[PDB]
Each structure stands twice: as C-alpha cells, then as structure tokens.
C-alpha cells in the first residue's frame, strides 16, 4: 500500500475516529477512483489485459480496506457503537467491515479472478448457427418480437445453455470464498450480510407480508396473459391450468411482460400506448433518449448531467466490434467529478424507461457527492433503484407522452385507463415474483440450504412457485439457469428491486400530493413540479447518512414499506382482471405444476 494511503495514528476515542474518517476519505477516494476506473476500462472493453488491470486494482482496494479496517478495529472496536455522532458510527461500521479483504492474499486473488471470469463468460456468451447472436441486442429482440414458439425456444435454450453451464463451477467456488470472507466479519453467511443493509430484524417476514398482499394481482394478471397466449399458441403449447412456458412472455427471464402488450391489450381501438414505433418513425437515437430524461430532472430543479457525463459515457453498443458488458449500469468514480452511464441503448419505449432508471442512479450520485465516501449510498439499496422509476411513472402517462411528441391522440376514458394500467402491470406487477425470488435462491445458496447439487432444482422450484412458469425444454443439474441472469455472475444483489417496486409507488404518491395533483394516482405527472423536486432532493441528498425508515417517514409520512400505494395505483385494473378471469372461468394459479410443453416437431432442425 502506497505510504500516502496507509493509516496513521489516531486517538482511541470519538474525536480521533472523526479525524480517522477524514484521513480515510482522503485516501479512499483515490483507491475507489482507480478501482472504478479499471472496472470501467474492462466493462467497456473486455480484454484479458483489462481484466488483469482490474484485478490488480481490486487487490489494492483489498489492501487499503484491510489496513484501514484493522486500524478501525484496533482503535475503536468496543466504543464505536456508543459514539454520539450517528453518521460517524455509520462511517466506522462500514470501514471495519472487511469483506473480501478478510481473505488471505491467494484467496483474494482467487476471488478477484472468479469475479472477472464469471463476468467475461456472461457478457461474451453467444448463441450460434457459423455466425452468432449476442444477448444484447440479438437475443433480446428475438424474445421481444418473435412469435414463433420454436424460434423463441432456440434463443431461450441457447442463451441459458451458453451462459449458465460454464458458470456453475466458478459460482460454487465464489460462494465458498464469499462466505469465508464475510464469516470473518461476524455474519453467518454472505446473504446475512446483504440483508443487514436494511437494518430491520424482521426483514424476511416483512417482505413475505408484502408479497401476500401483492400475489392476488399477479395471479390474475398471469391467468389473463395465459389465456391470451393460449389463443395464439394453442392448447399444445399453453396449458390453461399449468405454468406458462418461460420463453413466451417477451423477455429472456420472463421478468417483464411489456413486450407482449400487443397480444393482451383489451381495447385495441384506443391510442397505442407502446410508442416504440413512433420513436423509430421519428428517428430517436440514444442521445435523444438521454437528453429527454435529463430535461425531466431539470424540470424538477434537480441537476443536469455534467459535461464529464456526456464526454465519458457509453450510450450505444460499440460498433468497432469490441466486447463490452451491455447490461446498463451507472458509475460513480468517487472523485466528485466523473459520473457515467454504460448502456447498449436500443431505441424502444422500455429502453427509455431504463434510461431514466440509470439517470436516477446518477442523480443520486450528483446529490450526495459531498457526503463522506462511506455515506454515498442510497438510504437503502432499494431507494437507489427507485429514483428513476418514479420519474418514469410520470413519463409514461399518456398525457406526458403527448407533451413530448410521442402520442398525438390523448383520451381520458375508462377503456384507455384499463389499457394503460394493464400495460403498467405487465411491467410492474409481473416483475414482483421474480424480484422476490432471485435472492431467496441466493440466500439459500449462501446459507448452504441449496448446495450445488440442487442449484437448478431449487431455481426452478422458486420460478414455478412464484412466477408460475416452466422451462420449455428439460433441465437437469448440468444446467445452471440462475447463472444466465446477469446479477448472479456479476454478484449484484436483487431484493433491492422488489423493495423498489413497492417503494416507487410510495414515492409517486407522496410526490404527486406534494405537486398539488388531485386526480387519479395513475394519471399523475410531476413534470415541472419544483415542489416535488425539492422533496425528492431531500431524500437524494441524505445518502445513507440516516436510517432509511426516518428518511422514508419524512418523505411519505410512514416509516415502513407499504403496498397500499401500489394497490391504489392499480385498483381499476385489479378489479377489471378479477372480473374478466371469472367470466372466462379461469383457474387462478397453476395446479398442473408438473406440466411442461412438448418440443416442436423439426426442432432445432428448422431454425435456418
């Protein structure tokens, strides 16, 4: 560790801890910057050499973290919990958590190499046949727009086999080392550490109680979509009393169903709420999507994107051939100047929403950039995920789309409302079971309830249990279908997305009230509301300096996650779908839980 970066001496008391934290931040920023920079260099340009550079920077971060972590514990282990300065306790608590820095060198190097290799495998995997499709954009567009069962099956099977199978032995090794590292921080396993970020002794029970309130909405959306799919694909491939084949819902993970909106739209005579074609017809490109997102933020008197963002960001997939991580992401370089987005942006309505999601991350970074480095986080991770989604809730309203030139015809009638709420349910309600289940899978892997011998058995158990889908071809424990989802090999926790899909409607309700809006929750548009901007700004500027329950209370009047705002937003379509399924005599659920569809005849033969 360079001498400038090493901790000196500080007294063993709260006034020394404060000087400790100030000396820390000085050097932390440099170490974070070099780490993030090397990660950026790799993720925008996947090369063996860039992976080597990224691993060296990771090792330096581990060295730094160990030195300052062990100093924090040497000087403050039994007194930091009683510090009078609550932000200083949060700072000290973070610095003394060593994570992978608890591992011996050789195991640190093994750990960093496993992260690199799992990342390279996921983001460079291809499906072939010899020319080859990448996940983004090739397979993505096939899942979104093909309606050929055999073709969707070719993309779904090909991707899951190509990405998941080679990852499995690496993921086993990563789990063991991760657990070894965090057990030396006092946690029973890594998942317990991840869950600790919500500082709630009843987290899993609280989530289970939210899901109980939401599940009826998903069950009715599912039954209704399943009927629509049956009318297109027929009784051979859709079982009206079984799970839906997992490749037919518009998305490689069946996690958002927006893309099948044209098959499910109940009133096709109303305005077409999927404005993708209008964006194409109009010549929208990535940089227009990012400027339109930015201007919503500035309409609220939040910050524009700095020049460093426009000069540094990667907003389209590189045409120079080179391999990149295409999964969108938002980057804080911890120097208070550089912030970027890396996105292989495609010109589509859901991508416009994803642009807002990612710019919400950036706005958080811009607003808390002057807090101590340790507090440059969301009040909890689900807060960070929710910011951009809240604005996107306003952007997608038919009235807002009209304002920005994407929907010439506007209508305020009950049919149009049901169309809109149904489209939003395909995006928001359909995701809830998946958002909930992914970290149930990973918590069980980390705790050892799901050993490698049951990785895929337990994944599909949860996928069927919650989402009511089945794999369209047979799977066994050679397959590792969880690894075919980006966040698993790239070790990004998931429960934040379940939390944010609940939270964002709590935020939306509060911001709409603050803006003086007095109509139905789902037609609210907070655009140009500076009062709403100021209320959002207060949350963003808090970072993680204060308990999330208190930040939430100041914002929305309640100190807990609550499904009532989401249920209020969707109420009309919740009632409509219930009525429809009854009249159609649907079975809610999937009691033929063993059912799987047959293979197409002439599969995979006829793919050319």
């Amino acid at each position: 560790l360079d001498p400038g970066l090493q901790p000196g001496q500080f007294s063993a008391d709260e006034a020394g801890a404060q000087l400790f934290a100030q000396s820390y931040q000085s050097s932390a920023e440099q170490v974070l910057f070099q780490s993030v920079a090397a990660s950026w260099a790799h993720d925008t340009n996947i090369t063996a050499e860039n992976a080597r550079r990224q691993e060296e920077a990771a090792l330096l971060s581990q060295e730094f973290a160990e030195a300052w972590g062990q100093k924090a514990k040497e000087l403050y282990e039994p007194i930091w919990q009683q510090f009078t300065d609550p932000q200083l306790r949060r700072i000290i608590g973070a610095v003394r958590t060593l994570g992978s820095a608890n591992l011996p060198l050789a195991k640190r190097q093994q750990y960093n190499a496993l992260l690199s290799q799992m990342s390279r495998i996921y983001s460079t995997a291809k499906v072939c046949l010899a020319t080859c499709w990448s996940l983004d954009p090739d397979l993505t567009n096939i899942l979104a727009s093909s309606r050929s069962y055999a073709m969707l099956l070719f993309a779904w099977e090909g991707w899951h086999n190509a990405a998941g199978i080679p990852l499995k032995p690496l993921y086993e090794d990563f789990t063991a080392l991760s657990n070894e590292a965090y057990k030396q921080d006092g946690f029973t396993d890594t998942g317990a550490y991840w869950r600790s970020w919500y500082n709630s002794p009843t987290f899993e029970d609280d989530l289970e109680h939210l899901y109980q309130q939401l599940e009826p909405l998903y069950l009715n959306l599912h039954a209704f979509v399943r009927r629509a799919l049956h009318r297109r694909y027929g009784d051979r491939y859709i079982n009206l009393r079984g799970p839906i084949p997992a490749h037919l819902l518009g998305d490689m993970w069946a996690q958002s169903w927006e893309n099948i909106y044209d098959m499910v739209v109940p009133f096709p005579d109303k305005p077409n709420l999927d404005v993708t074609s209008t964006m194409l017809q109009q010549g929208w490109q990535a940089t227009h999507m990012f400027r339109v997102a930015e201007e919503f933020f500035t309409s609220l008197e939040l910050s524009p994107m700095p020049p460093e963002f426009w000069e540094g960001s990667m907003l389209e997939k590189p045409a120079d051939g080179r391999e990149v991580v295409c999964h969108a992401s938002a980057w804080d370089f911890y120097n208070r100047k550089d912030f970027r987005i890396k996105q292989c942006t495609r010109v589509t309505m859901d991508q416009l929403s994803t642009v807002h999601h990612e710019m919400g991350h950036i706005q958080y970074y811009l607003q808390y950039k002057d807090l101590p480095v340790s507090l440059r986080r969301g009040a909890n991770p689900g807060f960070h995920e929710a910011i951009g989604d809240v604005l996107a809730l306003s952007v997608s309203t038919p009235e807002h789309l009209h304002k920005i030139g994407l929907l010439d015809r506007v209508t305020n009638d009950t049919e149009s409302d049901i169309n809109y709420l149904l489209k939003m349910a395909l995006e928001k309600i359909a995701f809830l079971p998946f958002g909930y289940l992914v970290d149930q899978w990973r918590w069980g892997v980390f705790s050892g309830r799901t050993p490698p011998s049951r990785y895929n058995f337990d994944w599909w158990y949860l996928r069927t249990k919650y989402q009511g889908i089945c794999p369209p071809v047979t799977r066994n424990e050679t397959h590792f279908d969880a690894g075919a989802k980006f966040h698993v090999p790239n070790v990004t926790p998931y429960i934040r997305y379940f939390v944010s899909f609940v939270l964002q409607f709590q935020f939306h309700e509060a911001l709409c009230k603050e803006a003086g809006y007095e109509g139905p929750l789902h037609q609210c548009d907070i655009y140009r509301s500076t009062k709403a901007g100021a209320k959002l700004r207060k949350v963003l500027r808090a970072g993680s300096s204060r308990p999330w329950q208190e930040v939430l209370k100041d914002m929305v009047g309640l100190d807990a996650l609550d499904a009532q705002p989401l249920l209020k937003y969707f109420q009309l379509v919740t009632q409509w779908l219930q009525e429809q399924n009854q009249q159609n005599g649907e079975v809610l659920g999937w009691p033929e839980y063993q059912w799987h569809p047959p293979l197409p005849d002439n599969y995979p033969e006829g793919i050319d």
């Binding site: 994570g99 969108a328 958002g435 070790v491």
Partner: peptide, 11 residues
Amino acid sequence: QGLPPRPKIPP
C-alpha cells in the same frame, strides 16, 4: 467492503 460498491444497474 473490500471492493468498490457494484455499479448500479436495472433489474
């Protein structure tokens, strides 16, 4: 801990 926090990404 140990490393920089993950870049923030969509579901």
